[PDB]
């Protein structure tokens, strides 16, 4: 991802990663996914009474902070959005659709993610 940084100035050192990507962002993706499969198993389990609880559609905003402050977290979140769109789960989709509005380097608004 830092390739243009290596051509702009001759940078031959490795770019560094984020810790909260490892401990907050990607575990937040995995947070949303395992709750997703939990309400799926609950739907596939009988005996749900009137007025069931929807999937939590609240958004942890440190996730969006990493989207809008880290290009790597940005683009991997974009491809996560595309993958869940291929899975087409409306609940998580509109859960994470806020916060994608403000994202790093307009990557959510770039050619790649928009085309996909």
């Amino acid at each position: 991802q830092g390739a243009w940084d290596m051509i702009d100035s001759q940078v031959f050192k490795e770019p560094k990663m984020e810790v909260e990507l490892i401990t907050r962002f990607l575990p937040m993706l995995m947070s949303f996914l395992v709750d997703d499969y939990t309400f799926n198993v609950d739907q596939k389990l009988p005996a749900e009474e009137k007025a069931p609880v929807s999937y939590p559609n609240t958004l942890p905003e440190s996730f969006t902070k990493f989207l809008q402050e880290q290009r790597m977290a940005c683009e991997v979140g974009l491809y996560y959005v595309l993958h869940i769109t291929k899975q087409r789960n409306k609940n998580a989709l509109l859960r994470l659709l806020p916060g994608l509005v403000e994202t790093f380097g307009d990557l959510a608004f770039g050619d790649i993610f928009l085309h996909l």
């Binding site: 575990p27 995995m30 947070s31 395992v34 709750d35 499969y37 939990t38 198993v41």
Partner: peptide
């Protein structure tokens, strides 16, 4: 920790 409790909640 949240993740592991959601894991164990899905097992149930």
């Amino acid at each position: 920790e949240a993740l592991q409790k959601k894991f164990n909640k899905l097992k149930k």
